[PDB]
Write a protein that binds this ligand. Structure first.
Ligand SMILES: N[C@@H](CCC(=O)N[C@@H](CS)C(=O)NCC(=O)O)C(=O)O
Ligand SMILES: N[C@@H](CCC(=O)N[C@@H](CS)C(=O)NCC(=O)O)C(=O)O
Ligand SMILES: O=C[C@H](O)[C@@H](O)[C@H](O)[C@H](O)CO
Ligand SMILES: O=C[C@H](O)[C@@H](O)[C@H](O)[C@H](O)CO
Lengths: 197, 204
């Protein structure tokens, strides 16, 4: 039975992952907007960050941890592949997103010359990713997954972040629109996020 | 199982995977990798050019914790990640906090070389010392990291505890419960079997 409470940053891309996941699963939950921040935030998460998930005695932070937990509590729809081989591949992709893209998102969100280096790294990495979507509907092919969940807040914020993409990036934007069109995505978007595009 | 593990002979990350493999008693092949003369294909299989790498048929995994979670799911005996979703989540968060709080410093110690790295090494040592010393009181009442049952958390941290002398990390006396705990790990026959000859030399 669901008792989920999500402490969420209204313009936080990491929080948007969790918000997206909760709306995809269509279960009961409560979102608490955090203004960057009440004292209990650093009590619940010693790193002082959102998102934070609370369900009874459980306190979780880090968006991918939170989302994996939710995906296991409410397995429909399935966001992590059921097959162990596929699940491992996907976990490795998620991890690489964190290393290759979202460390730069953190720079953009949390910290000035570093911002420029961050944008360039994100452009370059997306340039490498773009050809995937020549043939694939979603990251793992036909099925929506945690990989799409994870990257969507970044793709959403490309203009907000002042990211210029290379010529080969067109299939990536088509892919991005396919995510943004999802009913859960629309529902999980904050008023503040909606203005970004 | 047709698992092949590319393993660094003194690589603490590789040791996690060797340890998991011996704990589960499955069939496997270890391919010993000499990181002083790293073969080109290591960088083909893993673009970060690091070991451990697990290859099983068409699957190529790297990152020790990803490899181990995969093995644990493929062969759940004994279960190293808790079955319960709440416990599994807690455990995953603990694992992640280990990588951030401890093993970024192990990476510094292992991967950065030269006289330039020595200031970074000293910081890595101090950070590891301070963090292990904070954790130590846990092992007064707990046999293993999650209590009575051995888990992935013990797997993850053991190669570091094994290497404290090797890294020149000295803990104060109040870290004794942590050392008792470490010996509780080291005495497991799986642990002893998974040690390479070079790793055995690491603790006088
Ligand atoms: N690694 C964390 C980072 C979360 C984070 O950095 N949140 C920012 C807001 S964008 C914060 O609360 N400071 C995650 O993936 O959830
Ligand atoms: N996060 C990785 C780190 C693995 C790693 O750093 N391996 C080191 C050996 S300790 C390596 O292969 N370095 C390659 C090199 O620089 O030659 C994991 O958990 O597997
Ligand atoms: O904004 C937070 C609200 O709590 C909202 O998320 C609802 O509770 C949810 O839609 C339940 O379905
Ligand atoms: O109560 C002890 C818990 O097991 C927890 O504290 C973990 O041991 C953690 O890894 C240390 O932060």
């Amino acid at each position: 039975g669901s008792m989920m409470v999500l402490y969420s940053g209204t313009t936080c891309p990491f929080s948007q992952r969790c918000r997206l996941v909760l709306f995809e699963k269509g279960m009961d939950f409560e979102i608490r907007d955090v203004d960057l921040k009440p004292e209990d935030i650093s009590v619940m998460n010693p790193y002082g960050q959102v998102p934070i998930l609370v369900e009874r005695d459980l306190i979780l932070y880090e968006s991918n941890i939170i989302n994996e937990y939710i995906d296991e509590r409410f397995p429909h729809p399935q966001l992590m592949p059921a097959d162990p081989v596929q699940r491992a591949r996907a976990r490795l992709f998620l991890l690489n997103f964190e290393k290759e893209l979202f460390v730069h998102v953190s720079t953009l969100e949390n910290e000035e010359k570093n911002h420029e280096k961050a944008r360039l790294a994100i452009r370059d990495r997306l340039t490498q990713l773009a050809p995937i979507f020549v043939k694939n509907k979603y990251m793992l092919g036909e099925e929506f997954s945690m990989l799409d969940v994870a990257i969507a807040p970044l793709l959403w914020r490309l203009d907000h972040y002042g990211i210029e993409l290379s010529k080969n990036a067109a299939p990536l934007m088509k892919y991005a629109e396919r995510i943004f069109s999802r009913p859960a995505y629309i529902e999980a978007l904050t008023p503040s996020e909606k203005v970004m595009r």
